[PDB]
Amino acid sequence: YMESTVASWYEQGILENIQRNKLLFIETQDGAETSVALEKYQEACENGRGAILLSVARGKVSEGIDFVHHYGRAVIMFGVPYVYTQSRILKARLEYLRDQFQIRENDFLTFDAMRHAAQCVGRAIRGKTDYGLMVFADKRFARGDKRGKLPRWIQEHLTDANLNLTVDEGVQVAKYFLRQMAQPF
Amino acid sequence: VRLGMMRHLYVVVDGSRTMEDQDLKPNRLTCTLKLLEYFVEEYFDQNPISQIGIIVTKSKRAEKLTELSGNPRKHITSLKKAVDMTCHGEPSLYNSLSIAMQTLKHMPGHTSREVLIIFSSLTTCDPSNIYDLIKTLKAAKIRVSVIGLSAEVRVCTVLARETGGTYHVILDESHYKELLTHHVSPPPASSSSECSLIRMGFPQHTIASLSDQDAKPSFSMAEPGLTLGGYFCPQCRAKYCELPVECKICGLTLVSAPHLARSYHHLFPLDAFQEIPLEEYNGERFCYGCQGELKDQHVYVCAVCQNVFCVDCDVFVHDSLHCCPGCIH
Amino acid sequence: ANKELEEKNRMLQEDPVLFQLYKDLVVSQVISAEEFWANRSDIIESIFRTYPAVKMKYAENVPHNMTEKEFWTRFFQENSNAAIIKRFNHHSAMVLAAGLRKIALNLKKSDRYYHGPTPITSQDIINSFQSIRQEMEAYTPKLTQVLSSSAASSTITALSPGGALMQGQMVPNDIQSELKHLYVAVGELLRHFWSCFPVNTPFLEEKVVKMKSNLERFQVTKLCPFQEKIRRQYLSTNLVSHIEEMLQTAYNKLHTWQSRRLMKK
Amino acid sequence: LNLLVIVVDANPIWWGKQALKESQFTLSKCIDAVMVLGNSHLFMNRSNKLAVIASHIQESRFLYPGSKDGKYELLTSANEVIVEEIKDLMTKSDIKGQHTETLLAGSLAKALCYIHRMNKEVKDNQEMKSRILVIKAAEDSALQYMNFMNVIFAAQKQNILIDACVLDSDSGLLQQACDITGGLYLKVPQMPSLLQYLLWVFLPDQDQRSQLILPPPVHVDYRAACFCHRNLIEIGYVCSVCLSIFCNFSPICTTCETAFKIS
Amino acid sequence: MKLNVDGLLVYFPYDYIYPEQFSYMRELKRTLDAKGHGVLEMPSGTGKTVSLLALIMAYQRAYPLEVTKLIYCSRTVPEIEKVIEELRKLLNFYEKQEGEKLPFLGLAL
Ligand SMILES: [Zn+2]
Ligand SMILES: [Zn+2]
Ligand SMILES: [Zn+2]
Ligand SMILES: [Zn+2]
């Protein structure tokens, strides 16, 4: 899915404009390339060029890496993280949970998505009270079930006013929030 | 707290594309230039001995819009000309800081070299890494205090804190005014800062000796017509139209006594007057400062003269007059 | 390399004033010109710095029986899907690599400011105080006492242009440019002559250049008075004496500092 | 409109010296002339307003915040209030031999903040062009230079014209003061005929001052001196902290105590 | 910074703790007192380690027989290195407070 989206953006002019605005780095299955790309991403973050690191939620990089101040400032989540519905291993794992312990298949699937999203979006608040915003570009997260299964600390901060902001409104509120966080305590 | 009276300041303006965005009520670049005109005039009015220089950076290249000078009008004209600048390209902190460093490297040690980067586009495309340039900046003791716009840039944060300057982000236009007005005042001298005596020259206005006898005709020194009288120099002996100005030959600053006197209030800051809302046995209806009835439940008093001042009196005294009227007595 | 010749060719006609003054220093054969200087697309470039492969290809395929339009055409030209991601990763890495080249103050005397640079019995106060206290027991004499016609007329006559308190030529135009040019020349040479004059510079290699510049002062002031003579013998009006003061004061500084150096020796 | 402020230097020592001398000119006549000038200023237009301040060695006091003789009520009130207050101030005054020099910087500071208060209160629709018609009458004090310079620069920034009208003495500090803000400087040598000078040189406002012939400004000697001597010096050696004009190069300036490093 | 926790007194190296830290410590002490397995969540990536370690050490001092030792597991070795750094800082703080070495051992496999 990441490759398809990247290819579509490349065919259109959006990707070139993104490249002009800020440097772009992408993740690959190979660990060597992943490590090199992340090493360059850190230097880009240190410098004023900036960087946009595209990765996969299940990618080992997402779990291994930790984002701190001036690292992964704004965490973008493109789509709810769901595993493919064809891998037969998950079919056993899921239908057995339905049969025993009485967990609905949809319930467990949404839980597996929300837990993974929280894992991959909770890094920006590592410590030392370093500001940062987590934007989820998916109307599915706006659903009550996803919000309810979301961790309490994120959900309570989340409000109905900004729950389903348009793209432009989200950009404006992000700019304003960054303004507020820029100033000292 | 030691203060550096004489400071050579460079206001680095970025002609980035992001300046096109009209986040403020008018165009961002136009607003910045319009307010920076006021900043320049006020800076010269609050530090005559100091001088300023503007570097405009766009399309990854930095150009000196106006070299160091003591004439606010020339810089104001440069600002008005730049108002119409195309505003296309990408800035380069390395290029801008390198130009500023090249010009400020040969400046005297006693004066405080300062840079105020009005950063608009968060991106910084530079030919070379700026962390290396940070080391040279620290070695050269050039203070750099960035003012970011709509972004808390990490590289500029480290720049400011490491080099000794301060980092800020614009909350709004009113706060932008406050930020620049605050930066107007001389910064305190730190441990790295050093002070040294500087040669100074005081010219006297001169005119025709007696009925244009043995006159001293001359045109100017930086379409000037003949001038019957004007300022001169102890050493250049070259006519100067306006003061204060650096010598074009000596290299010595020419400046009159009032210009120096204008900066004594910095050495003598006024202690804040405690604000007491209640009357506190103040039976004088008329405010001593303005001889007007106190229409609000507010009073200000010194620790020496123990006089009474209203809100307007205290605000004006601490803002512009920089001295207590009655407490002068 | 003839870098000096290249710079001279570049500035020969681009800047008029610089070359005008540099030539003027030689027009009368004042001094050698050596001391003068001794003392004082985007897309292709971006690709050039971006792709080292393109740099090597350009070096090997330098135009030879081909055309730059064809070279431009050659630019744009799951296996392909992964190639795009790899290409962005490599291209961003290349861009980044190209950008990455290998005291509280205390004082003891404050009244000095209260009386800055501006420069400057007992029973008399009592007498004056009592007399002034008794002065104004009568008020509002404005009807006649404040002013009188004779005094008013005297005041108006004084305010007249010939009176007290009120004291009360652009004929040449072409001479203005010549005077400006001469002043610019004087400034240009006085700049180097005064560059290190104020500093003592008690070193042999430092003092050599001040000695040479001091001789150059004589040599330039040798030719200045001839142009002065040419200008003077026109009308004997609107004397230009300010130029003389600069030369005489420079000479006075030179001779006084020479005497001081001899005294120090 | 125009807000005029008359800063009268009514120094009891000097004016009483005149009284003892029994000279033709007297403080009563000076006050009457100032009163006539203020009355004429308000006479110019309704929107115009005025105020008066009197200077004394101790402090400075404001002299100004029916038709019995067929008089304009407002000007009658002005006459009565100024006469009563000036008589009260002159009659009541403590004696202090230590301090006798006339105080002017504090009075000017009061005038400046008063003008600021009036500018704040007045409606934004009408623009106010304030002016300060300082009338000195005695020699200035050396110790007041710093504060007087502060107030002069504040006036320059706030766009108020200090029109000096020194008489019987030429205060270099005051002429320097008015030169900075561009105010006129007139030295009347005929004290009895002073009011004619006011109704010509000072009375016209800044609006019409440019389009009018007035006495040329007096040359200002912007002298500098070292803190040793108080003598004129053309070259000053200031430091980066004191900003003080000194005599000659020294290892360390006394007013600084800084650890200057030779070179 | 000695916190008078409801169960006992617990040392803490940093100057201040947020109310969520108080809640975390009290809930954790409740679980240890019940001596029953449980699960809890804390937002901060860092700070939870120090609070947890301090509470466990204080509980060990109060009831050494109740808990034989602490087995603190982390996802990855690079991450567990930060945990051992936090534990070293806490031990240095506690050693300074006590004035002498105590029979406490802590290590990473
Ligand atoms: Zn000079
Ligand atoms: Zn008041
Ligand atoms: Zn006071
Ligand atoms: Zn000093």
Task: Report on the architecture of this protein.
The structure is cut from a larger assembly and holds two copies of chain A, one copy of chain B (329 residues), one copy of chain C (265 residues) and one copy of chain D (263 residues). Chain A is mostly helical. Chain A is built from nine helices and four strands, in the order ααβαβαβααβααα. Chain A has helices at residues 2-11, 14-21, 31-46, 60-64, 88-99, 105-121, 144-149, 152-157, 167-182; strands at residues 23-26, 51-54, 74-78, 133-137. Chain A has a two-stranded parallel ribbon. A two-stranded parallel sheet of chain A has the order 3-4. Chain B has 329 residues and is of the alpha/beta class. Chain B is 30% helix and 16% strand. In chain B, the strands form three sheets. In chain B, strands 1, 2, 3, 4, 5, 6 and 7 form a seven-stranded mixed sheet that branches. In chain C, 66% of the residues lie in helices and 0% in strands. Chain C is built from 13 helices and no strands. Chain C starts with a helix and ends with a helix. Chain D has one domain (1-204). The radius of gyration of chain D is 21 Å and the shape is globular. Chains in contact: A-B, A-C, A-E, B-C, B-D, C-D. The complex binds zinc ion (4 copies). One zinc ion binds at residues 239, 241-242, 253, 255-256, 258 of chain D. Chain A: Belongs to the helicase family. RAD3/XPD subfamily. Chain A: A motif (Nuclear localization signal) lies at residues 139-152. Chain A: It comes from Homo sapiens.
Largest beta sheet of chain A, briefly? 2 strands, parallel
Order of helices and strands of chain A: HHEHEHEHHEHHH
- Ends of chain A: how far apart? 41 Å
CATH structural class of chain A: Alpha Beta
Small molecules bound: zinc ion
- Identify the quaternary structure here: part of a larger assembly
- Tell how many strands the DSSP assignment of chain A holds: 4
State the strand order across the main sheet of chain D: 3-2-1-4-5
* CATH-assigned fold name of chain A: Rossmann fold
* SS field, number of helical segments of chain D: 8
Spell the H/E element sequence of chain D. EHHEEHHEHEHHHE
* CA-based gyration radius of chain A: 18 Å
What share of residues are in beta strands of chain A?
5-15%
Strand arrangement across the biggest beta sheet of chain A: 1-2
- In CATH terms, the superfamily of chain A is P-loop containing nucleotide triphosphate hydrolases
β-strand number of chain D: 6
Distance between the ends of chain D: 59 Å
Percentage of β-strand residues of chain D: 5-15%
Anisotropy-based shape of chain D: globular
How many domains, in number, for the residues of chain A? 1
Protein name (chain A): General transcription and DNA repair factor IIH helicase subunit XPD
Family (chain A): Belongs to the helicase family. RAD3/XPD subfamily.
Motif (Nuclear localization signal) (chain A): 139-152
Subcellular location (chain A): Nucleus; Cytoplasm, Cytoskeleton, Spindle
